[PDB]
């Protein structure tokens, strides 16, 4: 199952100035780019068109091409309706659908960072917790059935006829396996007489990876997973362990990943390899983090 996300960010500075940029993610792979400077939607993968013909695509691109202008020009009128709301304003649209032959499509809209409006059923909707000054704007937008129609088309039927196309298209790219590379280091802990043992993992795909510090068969419970970090399209992760200075020895960073095939990267703290590498990377230590 893969969540297909259409992300649009629109910034209005004042009466005159406004810009809109958009990105498209399948799973966690960028497939489409659209710049306020650019006139046509850019492909970012050699399969981002999906199982759609040029005619099917040009018509859809045109559909959004008209939308971009229309959207900008609508908002700045909605502002004119409201002394109520003031510039500068930040519009964030989050469309898409998750594929399970079952799908759940969604269209969420966020105002100034807070999510306030969504599309539901056959119209736009305010949420629970939303402010009441967003009501008249909704009543104005729900008057247009013609738009409300064309949205439902894309949500109810078009997205999955498209997404199921992409999955089938980029099967080889989405299934690509990458070997993680790993190394160790240490930093003085925020505590007295302690040491944090960084273990680095870099360059793997897909995302799900397993890292644990070990004393043989024993999993070290103070192992702290980092947050995944992006690199191209690969993944970076680090797993820390706080140790009482003098316990460094006998430990090991173990990395399990689908691309290894039951043959894990195992890094022993204080092995000839660790000694040799940690030397290859010495430095003056200014400016280190406080």
């Amino acid at each position, epitope marked *: 199952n893969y969540t297909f996300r259409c992300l649009q960010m629109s910034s209005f500075a004042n009466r005159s100035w406004s810009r809109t940029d958009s990105v498209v993610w399948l799973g966690d792979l960028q497939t489409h780019r659209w710049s306020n400077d650019s006139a046509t939607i850019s492909f970012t993968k050699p399969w981002s068109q999906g199982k759609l013909s040029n005619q099917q695509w040009e018509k859809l691109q045109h559909m959004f091409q*008209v939308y971009r202008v*229309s959207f900008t020009r*609508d908002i700045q009128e909605l502002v004119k309706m409201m002394p109520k709301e003031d510039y500068p304003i930040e519009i964030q649209l989050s469309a898409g659908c998750e594929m399970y032959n079952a799908s759940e499509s969604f269209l969420h809209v966020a105002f100034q960072g807070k999510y306030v409006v969504r599309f539901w059923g056959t119209s736009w909707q305010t949420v629970p917790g939303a402010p009441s000054w967003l009501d008249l704007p909704i009543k104005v937008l729900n*008057a247009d059935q*013609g*738009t409300s129609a064309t949205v439902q088309m894309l949500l109810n039927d078009t997205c999955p006829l498209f997404v199921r196309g992409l999955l089938e298209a980029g099967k080889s790219d989405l299934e690509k396996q990458e070997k993680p590379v790993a190394w160790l280091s240490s930093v003085p802990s925020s505590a007295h007489g302690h040491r944090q043992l960084v273990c680095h993992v870099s360059g793997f795909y897909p995302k799900p990876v397993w890292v644990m510090w070990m004393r043989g068969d024993q999993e070290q419970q103070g192992t702290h997973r980092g947050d995944f970090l992006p690199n191209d399209e690969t993944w970076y992760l680090q797993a820390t362990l706080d140790v009482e200075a003098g316990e460094e020895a006998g430990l090991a960073c173990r990395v399990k990943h689908s691309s290894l095939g039951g043959q894990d990267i195992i890094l022993y703290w204080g092995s000839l390899h660790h000694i040799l590498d940690a030397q290859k990377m010495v430095w003056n230590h200014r400016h280190h983090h406080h």
Partner: T-cell receptor
Amino acid sequence: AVTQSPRNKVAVTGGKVTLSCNQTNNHNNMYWYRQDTGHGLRLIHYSYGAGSTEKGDIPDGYKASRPSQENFSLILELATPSQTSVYFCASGDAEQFFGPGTRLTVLE
Amino acid sequence: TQVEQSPQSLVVRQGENSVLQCNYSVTPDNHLRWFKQDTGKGLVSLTVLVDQKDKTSNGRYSATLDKDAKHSTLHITATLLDDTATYICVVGDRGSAGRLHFGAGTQLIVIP
């Protein structure tokens, strides 16, 4: 129905002309237009509701004002010979309903 | 000009057909109203066309629309004298409370 007063007006260059417009159809959007030969109607000012004014396409020389929902006025601060035309007032909730039109002649 | 009307002036012998044209280059194009202006008076809405390819009738007036060409046409069958007016073609760009687009209109003179 939409009603405009005055219906006809002769004004002097640099004079202060005002064209009041009225409707009791309980609308919210009100528009001012200018008609000149070989042109078609052009928007001058418009209002999304009470206490609101918004510049249209040709707003230079004109000020709009809305004190109530029912009424919408257009002010020519310094009248110009270049502003001799027929002015229309419309309204909507879109189905725009138009008024009888005012003939304003501005002379030197 | 954003919206063009043909001809400038059509002249018909009372009690015959009369076709008036309208071409627009406006996007997006929600609908199209035809108006009727009695010389020295307001505008009166004859008919409206919303669909991609639309056809409609009202009295002797019957109008057509094809958005695949962004084009309109107004037919009046068996013209009366009291039809001598200007007919203006008006395009609506959004189906919500949007700015209308006005053609220069067509003055229709009917000879008896």
